[PDB]
Design a protein around this nucleic acid. Structure first.
Ligand SMILES: [Mg+2]
Ligand SMILES: [Mg+2]
Ligand SMILES: [Mg+2]
Ligand SMILES: [Mg+2]
Ligand SMILES: [Mg+2]
Ligand SMILES: [Mg+2]
Ligand SMILES: [Mg+2]
Ligand SMILES: [Mg+2]
Ligand SMILES: [Mg+2]
Ligand SMILES: [Mg+2]
Ligand SMILES: [Mg+2]
Lengths: 101, 247, 140, 75, 72
RNA sequence: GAAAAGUGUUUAAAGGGGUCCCCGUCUCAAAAGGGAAACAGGUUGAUAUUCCUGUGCCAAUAGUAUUAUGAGUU
RNA sequence: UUAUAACAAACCUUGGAAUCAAUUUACUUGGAGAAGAGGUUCGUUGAACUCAAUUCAAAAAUUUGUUUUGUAGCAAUAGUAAUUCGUAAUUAUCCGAAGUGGUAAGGACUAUCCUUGAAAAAAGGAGGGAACGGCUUUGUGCUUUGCUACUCUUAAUACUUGUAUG
RNA sequence: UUAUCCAUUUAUAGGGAUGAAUU
């Protein structure tokens, strides 16, 4: 069991680890994403390469009035994660789209 | 010149044994208090092929005297052993085919196999299919025993040294001709890559003492000294005589 | 003679009671449309008294030596009869009743049998070899 | 209690090479670490060899009581 | 997907509160056959009735908080 | 072995399982060997056993307390 | 565990086999128990079979007869081919026999080998009999005293514990 | 024999007279 008289390294700086702002970067337009928004209430977000599904969900919860049933993700060949977020039935992605912009 | 085929073998690369399918090493029991002072009986639970060998194995199960559990040995099967036979091992064992006894306790003439040359060696001599040794005498001093190995050689061993009464299974396997090259192929395919043997005399000089010539002939005496080096030791090594054996 | 006389102890060889030792109570040997085989009717022990030390306390010993019994009609070809006979140490007619094999409260009967067995084990007598044999679980 | 058959054990067990044996201490057989084993062996070696007189004279070490008395005096 | 044959069992299932939806289907037989499906959290239980009136009666019987889906 | 490297239990005080005993080198090596579980239909300009509708399946699911579900024992 | 059916095996009971018998394309098998008679199981398969339901009528403490359904559920709501009607909706169809033996898989076997044809994670089963109710009170986890809902078991629900589903 | 060397095993009882076997 450790009992160091002082800790070795103490990062006093504000955390570098990615917050909501930084994790999730921006929604996608593109005809595909628009279609998704219209038809099956799935919002498409470009996110950081090092976002997990859990993390993305958390971000979405924090950044917007969104509850997400399921999140699929993929790594784009442009070095971004694209997260397809299916909203719970209580919410209309269209309305939330409008709210965001 | 080049490195001869023989020399290549020692580096063991492709010339290692084909060890993969083998069932394990064939060994007698560890030399416990039981086997030294009395007898232990085990069941031959199954008799099995061990690939690269010519002699079938017997998986014999013993009960461990110092912890509750069954443990398996791999014995070489003497002819006449069978599944569900009891095999007994120890100083005070009875003299039956299959059983494992110190050579001191077998009268002359008895036929044995899996013989330890030193006590505890887990059995080392007379293992090949068909082979057996003979107890030829025990000295009035006790202690040592005289045995005659399949070669013909007579050797003196400790009487405490263990052995297995009977002859090794799969006898006469050499009686049947291999006939086909392929059957030899299959034989060595399970042992190690020693087959085809190209003749030194069919090689070039870089490759072999015998290599080259406009004729295919060895060209120099093919009896080589004991005290030759690696690439010289090639024909009849250290040959005391040569030619059709008359004796 | 007639190997299986009422009271003889047998080893069941077949079924759920596979290696259990038991007392035959009434042999029939009459083949019928119902049971086309000579059958024996047997009262036996499923779960023997566990091993017990002098050191142990009396209640705990009693608990340990509970003996869980069973009553089963069985083909005589499935039972290995023994030399051991317990016509004496039990009133044998009292163990199993033919009629009660059919009856609803069979479990009650079984319980009673078990209790009787336990009692017998507690008071051995002088000490019969048969009873000793019955006591010991068969190890196979 | 005192019943013949409730407490009857089949304890007549031990014949050679049949059934697990009873038990022994095993101290004689335990492997021990390399160091400590060497010390043990070293001691034995020392005992065993012909020890030169001077060295030997370093292990005739008084009688115990007398030594204790001496120590007390020194105190 | 499971089939049910004991009407009583079906009723019991219906009574149980994880049964959110009923699906009631009408099928021209080779008369009007009726398939009663209950959508439980675990399984989709279905009962087939040859007899329309009986089917109707059982539908009526079904708790009025069920989320009834009339397919065709 | 000057090291670089070469060998891998050869003379080790080499992490797990139970309530001190009992096991026991580590690690990588298979996108054709071993192996928890998925199907159908629909949908896009470009993806689909991966999205949609439907229908399942597998593995988890900490404690404490209620509920119900059935067993067993009195 | 798809329910059942049918089938190659394996086993059980009964039965007691030479005038040998059963039996395969092949040989295999039998007093260490064959044939015959009745069963059990695994495996194929995955709705076969009256399979399930219902129709009513008769017999016991529930089984037989007749009929109508169900593409067994999934499942027709989906597909396909049609037919219209509108500027997406309706309808009608989807079902009775069988052969060939190309491919795959399984089965039971038989044969060859101086060739006998990986391992482990993981899982399971067995053997064994360690340990053993709960609550309340007293004394130093253990013992004594008194009362009867208990020990499991899934599922849901609630609440603290880092946010207890992928 | 104690150096050294080899073997054997879990370093498992000091020397002699086709079931089970563990708390
Ligand atoms: Mg992915
Ligand atoms: Mg040759
Ligand atoms: Mg040649
Ligand atoms: Mg040439
Ligand atoms: Mg040369
Ligand atoms: Mg030439
Ligand atoms: Mg020539
Ligand atoms: Mg790996
Ligand atoms: Mg694979
Ligand atoms: Mg494409
Ligand atoms: Mg249609």
């Amino acid at each position: 069991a450790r009992n160091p008289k002082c800790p070795r390294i103490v990062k006093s700086c504000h955390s570098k680890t990615l917050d909501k702002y930084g994790l999730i970067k921006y929604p996608l337009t593109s005809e595909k994403a628009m279609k998704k928004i219209e038809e099956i209430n799935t919002l498409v977000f470009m996110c950081d390469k090092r976002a997990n599904k859990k993390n993305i969900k958390k971000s979405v919860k924090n950044l917007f009035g969104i509850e997400c049933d399921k999140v699929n993700v993929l790594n784009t060949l442009n070095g971004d994660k694209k997260a397809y977020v299916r909203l719970s039935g209580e919410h209309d992605a269209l309305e939330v789209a409008n709210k965001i912009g | 010149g080049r490195v001869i085929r023989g020399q290549r073998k020692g580096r063991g690369s492709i010339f290692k044994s084909h060890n993969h399918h083998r069932k394990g090493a064939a060994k007698l029991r560890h030399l416990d208090y039981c086997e030294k002072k009395g007898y232990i009986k085990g069941l031959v639970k199954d008799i099995i092929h061990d690939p690269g060998r010519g002699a079938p194995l017997a998986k014999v199960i013993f009960k461990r005297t110092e912890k509750y559990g069954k443990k398996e040995e791999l014995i070489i099967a003497s002819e006449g052993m069978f599944t569900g036979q009891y095999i007994s091992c120890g100083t005070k064992a009875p003299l039956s085919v299959g059983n494992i006894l110190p050579i001191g306790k077998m009268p002359e003439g008895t036929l044995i196999c899996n013989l330890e040359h030193r006590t505890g060696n887990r059995g080392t001599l007379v293992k090949a299919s068909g082979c057996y040794a003979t107890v030829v005498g025990q000295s009035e001093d006790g202690k040592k025993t005289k045995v005659r190995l399949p070669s013909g050689a007579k050797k003196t061993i400790d009487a405490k040294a263990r052995a297995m009464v009977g002859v090794v299974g799969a006898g006469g396997r050499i009686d049947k001709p291999i006939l086909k090259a392929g059957v030899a192929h299959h034989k060595y395919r399970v042992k190690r890559n020693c087959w085809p043997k190209v003749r030194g005399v069919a090689m070039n000089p870089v490759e072999h003492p015998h290599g080259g010539g406009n004729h295919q002939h060895i060209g120099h005496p093919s009896t080589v000294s004991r005290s030759a080096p690696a690439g010289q030791k090639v024909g009849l090594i250290a040959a005391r005589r040569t030619g059709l054996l008359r004796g | 003679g007639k190997l299986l006389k009422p009271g003889k102890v047998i080893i069941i060889l077949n079924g759920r009671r596979a290696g259990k030792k038991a007392v035959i109570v009434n042999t029939y040997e009459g083949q019928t449309r119902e049971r086309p085989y000579s059958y024996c009717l047997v009262a036996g022990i499923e779960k023997h008294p566990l091993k017990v030390n002098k050191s142990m306390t009396k209640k705990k010993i009693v608990k340990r030596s509970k003996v869980k019994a069973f009553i089963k009609c069985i083909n005589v070809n499935h039972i290995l009869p023994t030399r051991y006979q317990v016509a004496n140490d039990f009133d044998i007619k009292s163990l199993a009743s033919d009629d009660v094999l059919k009856s609803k409260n069979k479990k009650k009967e079984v319980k009673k049998l078990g209790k009787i067995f336990r009692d017998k084990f507690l008071e051995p007598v002088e000490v019969s070899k048969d009873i000793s044999f019955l006591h010991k679980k068969l190890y196979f | 209690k005192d019943n013949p058959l409730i407490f009857e054990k089949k304890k007549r067990s031990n014949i050679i090479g049949v059934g697990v044996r009873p038990k022994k201490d095993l101290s004689k057989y335990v492997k021990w670490p390399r160091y400590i084993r060497i010390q043990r062996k070293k001691k034995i070696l020392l005992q065993r060899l012909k020890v030169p007189p001077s060295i030997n004279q370093f292990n005739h070490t008084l009688p115990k009581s007398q030594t204790q008395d001496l120590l007390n005096f020194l105190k | 997907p499971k089939q049910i044959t004991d009407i009583r069992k079906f009723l019991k299932i219906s009574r149980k509160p994880d049964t959110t939806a009923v699906i009631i289907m009408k099928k021209k037989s080779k008369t009007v056959i009726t398939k009663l499906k209950l959508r439980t959290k675990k399984y989709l239980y279905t009962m087939v009735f040859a007899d329309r009136k009986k089917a109707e009666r059982i539908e009526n019987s079904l708790l009025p908080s069920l989320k009834r889906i009339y397919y065709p």
